[PDB]
Design a binder for this molecule. Structure first.
Ligand SMILES: Nc1nc2c(ncn2[C@@H]2O[C@H](COP(=O)(O)OP(=O)(O)O)[C@@H](O)[C@H]2O)c(=O)[nH]1
Ligand SMILES: Nc1nc2c(ncn2[C@@H]2O[C@H](COP(=O)(O)OP(=O)(O)O)[C@@H](O)[C@H]2O)c(=O)[nH]1
Ligand SMILES: Nc1nc2c(ncn2[C@@H]2O[C@H](COP(=O)(O)OP(=O)(O)O)[C@@H](O)[C@H]2O)c(=O)[nH]1
Ligand SMILES: [Mg+2]
Ligand SMILES: [Mg+2]
Ligand SMILES: [Mg+2]
Lengths: 397, 397, 397
């Protein structure tokens, strides 16, 4: 029963939390396993330490016929910014909640943008609080505000599902009648539309193991009679001997070789699979030709680069980051996967100085190339300390 | 109509094959379904690839009032060694054939031993070729030679059935008169005693689903808000949620949990049954506390160990095995169910070096414990390659 | 643009063929694709071999806005009896043509009855030759003869559409003016009424893939470590693993299992779909519990039986069937789907001996049960030869 990661985003007070609890109670009915949670519990998210940052985050699990959804919900707009970016929990899709009373709001528009920068593959809307509004001209109005926003950030606003309802009401019915099921109640039934929407519109994702092969080099060693060895946990896909791969990054050019040998826990091994911390025998590679920080991957699967654009969040001083701001020309270290790689920043027009606590978008240009791809997450460091966290959003070269 | 697995064993030329063709013909008469086979067909067994080994093996099915018997027969003494050991086809009982003219012979004695190591629950004798000997002093002699051998290997030689007849003669009658039935002919009737003897003496076996629950861990996973998941095909019995089971092997100690969730083909599932490839939800178990190679089983059903005795067969080089022999201290990989577990061998007094193609018996001692039981079959590997096949014969600790 | 199957039935000379050619040319006008055919071409049907029988049958395709109709028309009353029964081509609806000059006639009445036995879902009438009769008292008379007949065989004669016209005349206008469209001409416009009638009155059919899952067992096998396998072409709907199905027929009782494995062209497969020749892995099913001749189907979708009524056609001797007639007590083999199942026949009152060439209606009673449903087509064989063809018309138990 495939597993998917979702979460509620949207402006404060629009009701992402109440809608969250409803989802549990409602789906539980047809899925007894499913552990029902209420408002207060979810409303009080725990802290979570991620990349050096703390994010109040709440989680919940619910099941449909089609799947198992683990679902996030945070208490503050800040928690959203940080979560999404450090990618504490990675949305495979997200449920966007908007007050029918207010239409989309600033955070609303912000979560859309992030969701797009950080790569959310699909957004589905749940217009809540609809019980405060009869006038369908109004409900239409809001729906439309919302779609144009989505369209502004490239979501297919024209297509997503905008389901209108009352999380508050549905939740009480689940309260009154835990055993209520489909067709029985109206408010509950909008939740079923949401849930259906989800199962339908949010793509079932690629299992890591099926994604193109990539393993990031951690250590390099020579086995006297055997040769050069790149070690590290495989991020995705798999390798079996005889497999040819590319050593990407840092070097001036990409090299190709053949795993002539996997190995783990000392013993040998026939295939290296995602999740696996192996050591591979690279064939025809000097101890120079390969180094920590490069990546090995299924050939042609990833490219090296130096100029890219990123969405970033800069730690506060209180969180252990910088204590004064910076300008274009700031040149910290960019820690990609396993190592630092210096880079110079260039703030966009309109930005003149970035401050501790901000979150912005700029370009960077690195000293050496690195196997980069959009969505590639990273850290910004000053002497080993993390001063910020970002996500790669665009390659420029 | 319960199904039982049998077959002929005994020395070369004693007539296990001719006896084989007679059982079909004879029992066909009262069971028309029954497909009659002759000597030549059975005589030419096909090869069968089992555990990396090739075994000429012949099969035949016959029915009595009481049952359905699928019956094996191999052409050579090697074939028996291999078959019995890799357990290509598992004997529920065996029919031991001995030439009345010669008495038991070397392979005769060997098969008895194997059958005992390999676990054959019952042996029943068919003394054949009796047409060559009038002297009842002789016939008794052999019978008793036979009983003492069985007694020597722990079979209840004193009690088994030693039926005296001529497979050759019964077979021709069935030939002359397919329709011949009980009471009609003498030679045929000896076959009826055999068949009766079989139905009577060979215990009717436990249906897997009825054996105590056991499932060997193949993969372990976590379902975020759900938890830990042990996957694999169920070997025996069944599981339903809330069932409590032990996690056995590898770890320093046995753990108990509760399946909190079965599941198959994505969808859910109320009960896990023998033959089924599920994924169970283990309650309160770290992703560490459970691993591939262990087994989950009905509590108190199977115990972990490291020292055991085993009867083994070593591949010839021509079959892809080792190409030189070995001594005590040999330390290959013993592949139990799903994983390799290193072990050191100790040859018994009298054996000093084992060679490719040999089949012997020795003790082993594993690096980590494993859920072992007598009868547990396994492989001996050297770099993923299978260099021998064995069966666990006794537990030492 | 859904596809539907129709055709013209009715007495000889009433003009089923001339009206057939008109539909092409008329509908063509608004559907350029549509291939126009004339009288002579449709008049000269080719043979078709169906169930061993030869049927002169003519085909034609035309399009309305609403659909795609493939449309049959045969030359002789025999052709109709044969066709309808062996169901060479299955009518989703039929267009019944009657001469306004003569009213319904014997074949007219015959066709209604068959269409009812054979299961035609809707009849729509086209009263033709109307140009030979001014007196509306007459035209009303015929129409009413017609409706009473349909009412006699359970069609809703009171409701169906009785469209009055001249196929011959519409056809010449289309001839004169291929481009003639609606409103332009009167005779053509009557054809438009027929076409609308059809699109409206004849219910839109179920695509096979959407009908309930059913697959008829052709062979049964065992995959040693996997278990039992039923193979054969899926007749309707689809199967995906984890799907539960019922094994129906032959056995004394219906069993339920789960496909635990589909498979085709050696490779595996995620879903088994109508048309596909798979092999299914039945879970928990003995090699006895399943056999050729039964069907696997969506649970509760079809039931086993032994007594049924049927409309049948008996081959002439010249066509290779019996060379003498038979009485009640006749007990041939009823070849349902894949196998023969013996049955005894009982001629109805009034019928005393059936002869080669006859087509009649009687009851049968099978030795073992079979997954039967009205509409189920079958063959009557004598030693492998087909001596007749029929259709199941009613279940009696
Ligand atoms: N009228 C109305 N009020 C709602 C509905 N959903 C939630 N509310 C309330 O709106 C407030 C915001 O709820 P909340 O879920 O906590 O939103 P969050 O800030 O996005 O976490 C709470 O007081 C809820 O009781 C609803 O459908 N209709
Ligand atoms: N006289 C006699 N010879 C027999 C009888 N059974 C088998 N034979 C012969 O024994 C020889 C070996 O028979 P077979 O069944 O092949 O022995 P197996 O190699 O143990 O299979 C053949 O030539 C048979 O004809 C019997 O009951 N009496
Ligand atoms: N008067 C008149 N004759 C017609 C009409 N339609 C058909 N005919 C003639 O009917 C005769 C037999 O018709 P046909 O279409 O072959 O019918 P089928 O016997 O059902 O195959 C032919 O000579 C046609 O030309 C019509 O509408 N009016
Ligand atoms: Mg909240
Ligand atoms: Mg033999
Ligand atoms: Mg015609």
């Amino acid at each position: 029963k495939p597993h998917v990661n979702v979460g509620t985003i949207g402006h404060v007070d629009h009701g992402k939390t109440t809608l969250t609890a409803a989802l549990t109670y409602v789906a539980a009915a047809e899925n007894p396993n499913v552990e029902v949670k209420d408002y207060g519990d979810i409303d009080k998210a725990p802290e979570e330490r991620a990349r050096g940052i703390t994010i109040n985050t709440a989680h919940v699990e619910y099941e449909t016929a089609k799947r198992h959804y683990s679902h996030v919900d945070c208490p503050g707009h800040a928690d959203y910014i940080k979560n999404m970016i450090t990618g504490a929990a990675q949305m495979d899709g997200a449920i966007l909640v908007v007050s029918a009373a207010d239409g989309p709001m600033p955070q609303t528009r912000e979560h859309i943008l992030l969701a797009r920068q950080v790569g959310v593959p699909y957004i589905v809307v749940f217009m809540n609080k609809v019980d405060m509004v009869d006038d369908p001209e109004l409900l239409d109005l809001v729906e439309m505000e919302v779609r144009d926003l989505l369209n502004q950030y490239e979501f297919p606003g024209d297509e997503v599902p905008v389901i209108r309802g009352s999380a508050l009401l549905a939740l009480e019915e689940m309260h009154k009648n835990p055993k209520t099921k489909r067709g029985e109640n109206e408010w509950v039934d909008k939740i079923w539309e949401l849930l259906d929407a989800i199962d339908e519109y949010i793509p079932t994702p690629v299992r890591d193991v099926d994604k193109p092969f990539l393993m990031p080099v951690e250590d390099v060693f020579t086995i006297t009679g055997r040769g050069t060895v790149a070690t590290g946990r495989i991020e995705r896909g798999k390798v079996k001997v005889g497999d040819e791969v590319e050593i990407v990054g840092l070097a001036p050019e990409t090299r190709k070789t053949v795993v002539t040998g996997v190995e783990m826990h000392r013993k040998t091994l026939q295939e290296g699979i995602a999740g696996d911390n192996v050591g591979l025998l690279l064939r025809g590679v000097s101890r120079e030709e390969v180094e920590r920080g490069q990546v090995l991957a299924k050939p042609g699967s990833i490219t090296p680069h130096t100029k890219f654009e990123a969405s970033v969040y800069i730690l506060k001083k209180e969180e252990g980051g910088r204590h004064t701001g910076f300008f274009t020309g700031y040149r910290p270290q960019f820690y990609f996967r396993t190592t630092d790689v210096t880079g110079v920043v260039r703030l966009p027009q309109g930005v003149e100085m970035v401050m501790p606590g901000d979150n912005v978008t700029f370009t960077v240009e690195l000293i050496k190339p690195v196997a980069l791809e959009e969505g590639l997450r990273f850290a910004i460091r000053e002497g080993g300390r993390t001063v910020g966290a970002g996500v790669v959003t665009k390659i420029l070269e």
